[PDB]
Amino acid sequence: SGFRKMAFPSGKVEGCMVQVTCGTTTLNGLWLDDVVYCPRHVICTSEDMLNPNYEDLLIRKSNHNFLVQAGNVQLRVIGHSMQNCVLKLKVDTANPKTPKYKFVRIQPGQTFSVLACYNGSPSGVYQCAMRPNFTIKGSFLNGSCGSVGFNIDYDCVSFCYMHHMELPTGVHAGTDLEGNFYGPFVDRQTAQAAGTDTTITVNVLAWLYAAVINGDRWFLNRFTTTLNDFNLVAMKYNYEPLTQDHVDILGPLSAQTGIAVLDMCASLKELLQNGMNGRTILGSALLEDEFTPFDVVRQCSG
Amino acid sequence: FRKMAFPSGKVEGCMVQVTCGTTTLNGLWLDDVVYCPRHVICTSEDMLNPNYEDLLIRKSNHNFLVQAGNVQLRVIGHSMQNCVLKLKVDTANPKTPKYKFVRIQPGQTFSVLACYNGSPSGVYQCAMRPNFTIKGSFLNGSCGSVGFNIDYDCVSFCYMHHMELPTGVHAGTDLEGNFYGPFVDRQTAQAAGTDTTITVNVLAWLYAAVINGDRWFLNRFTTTLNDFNLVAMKYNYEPLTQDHVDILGPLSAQTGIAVLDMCASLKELLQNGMNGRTILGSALLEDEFTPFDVVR
């Protein structure tokens, strides 16, 4: 295959990472203008973390309890509040490296880059896909909370994920930057299982379009299907149903190849019902579901 | 566990655009020097068979347009070092990191910051293959994008991009302008040597697979280093040296599995196959994680 998981350049986010310490708990925070955003569990002790009373724990905190540092330089906290599972610390200095930015809440299937950070210091960058069960397959060690996920469009950074926890199967969960968890998880030190996962159909379809663009088109059959017929079949193979939004985001690739979205669905349906018959697509007997239609365009054209 | 690139910000602050005629690519601006592939001086007809010393003597400073963002930098000097052009400019780059130029060895990894028109586009990890190609993602206009590693705020630049071979793989130079591999900066079809698999890296990745609880491929058998290497050579894997065995020490100690016992499992994989099963999600043995990468 000529495809890579490619992250966005991380510099505009690196300039925003700080560390936040309460007591002995240190994690990362995101400094945009004069506010630092971080997971609210920084205020917890190990006695509190099994079912912390966050409202009562916060009552006992003052601005002077929070150690915010850019490197070893302390930023003075002048205000604090909690929004869902995120703490917002107002600081007395506006970050001069603040990029143009937005906070967005993504859907399952969408991809984003994660800048993994420890002690406020960026350590690595990689691309993740939000699964249908609202987990991501990250590489996150102790101290990585507050690391963020983002996309960049025309030098505007859209922040979509802030890291909070690791589930029993090793996958990761977190919130948007308004502090609302993706998925049913809660920020307590308790066993919480990731639900059963499914395959991201819209992204498999994008991958089949990528194959066609590259001349690998043996699977294009002569059938079509309806969207409802397809969704009912797909669910029997543990594939996600398509939404109208998914049909629309496939528009550009459909136009580029001249293959109708519903014809491509009929092709995928044959692959599901009959297997690959030993053949390969883009040099693989596995269908790939972590490349979105935008990722394909971002790589096939460019 | 997965493929992770270094944060790219220190490198992003160094990328510029270099133009000569109708040819545009990226340059790397460190202090008062911009480094870029020398083929920027070629027309499309020149590229078919360039005499670079001849083409360069026919150029002056003003044929080179360097843009950092939308601000033009004035070229006040130029020289050629192998396949790299060094343009002296009137301004020092304020964002120059602490840096080194290094030539990497086959099997070692680096991050690539792909750029177009002087602007960073994407970041990903590559390994230098034994045949001195890299499997990257580079399109028209990506030349002059760089590969690098970062160690305690020091950026070690190891790769500058020049070309795509007919098979789709990529080739380029160190920052002294010497190619990795038997390639030349001419617009002509060029094949690489037969590729081989980076054995020490496959072993590192199999250790990662065990640590993550994926163990179906392990066995109670064993092997000597020499007997393993005979099989490796038969399947176009690189030899495993004693230094490689040593480098795998931490991984072997962390798990309970001696290096030569992991070698015995790999031997069976090469001889039997994976039989439709997968390891860490892959249907294929992965050789682009180094031991150090795995330990991070």
Say whether B12 and A9 touch across the interface (CB within 8 A).
yes
Give me the residues of A, 108-137, that contact B with CB < 8 A.
Answer: 115-116, 122-126, 137
Pairing of strands A77-83, A121-129: unpaired
**Domain annotation for chain B: domains and CATH numbers:** 11-173 (2.40.10.10), 199-295 (1.10.1840.10)
In order of A7, A208, A239, A291, B222, the CA distances from A109 in angstroms are 16, 16, 12, 8, 43
Structure's resolution in angstroms: 1.5
Point out the residue among A6, A170, A286 whose CB comes nearest to the CB of B123: A6
Residue B276: closest CA among chain A residues belongs to which residue? A285
Q: Are B122 and B142 a contacting pair, CB within 8 Å?
A: no
For helices A227-236 and A261-274, angle between their N-to-C axes, nearest 10 degrees? 30
Q: Are A228 and A267 a contacting pair, CB within 8 Å?
A: no
Q: Are A11 and A127 a contacting pair, CB within 8 Å?
A: no
Give me the residues of A, 4-33, that contact B with CB < 8 A.
Answer: 4-12, 14-15
CA distance A11 to chain B (A): 4
Cβ-Cβ pairs closer than 8 A, A with B, add up to 76
- What is the rounded distance in angstroms from the CA atom of residue B144 to the CA atom of residue B130? 22
Beta-carbon contacts of A160 under 8 Å, excluding residues fewer than 6 positions away, are A103, A104, A105, A106, A110, A112, A149, A150, A151, A176, A177
- Shortest CA distance to A161 belongs to which of A33, A39, A70, A40? A39
Other CB atoms within a 10 A radius of the CB of residue A147 amount to 29
- Shortest CA distance to A75 belongs to which of A21, A24, A147? A21
**B205-241: buried (b, 16+ CB within 10 Å) or exposed (e) per residue?**
bbbbbbbeebeebbeeeebeeeebbebbeeeebbebe
Strands (E), chain A: 17-22, 25-32, 35-39, 67-70, 73-75, 77-83, 86-91, 100-103, 111-118, 121-129, 148-153, 156-166, 172-175
- What is the rounded distance in angstroms from the CA atom of residue B101 to the CA atom of residue B177? 11
Q: Are A80 and A66 a contacting pair, CB within 8 Å?
A: yes
Q: Are A179 and A40 a contacting pair, CB within 8 Å?
A: yes
In order of A244, B75, B157, B222, the CA distances from B103 in angstroms are 51, 27, 8, 36
- What is the rounded distance in angstroms from the CA atom of residue A30 to the CA atom of residue B197? 41
CA distance B226 to chain A (A): 33
- What is the rounded distance in angstroms from the CA atom of residue A284 to the CA atom of residue A301? 21
Beta bridge partners of B33: B30, B88
What letter would DSSP give residue A199? B
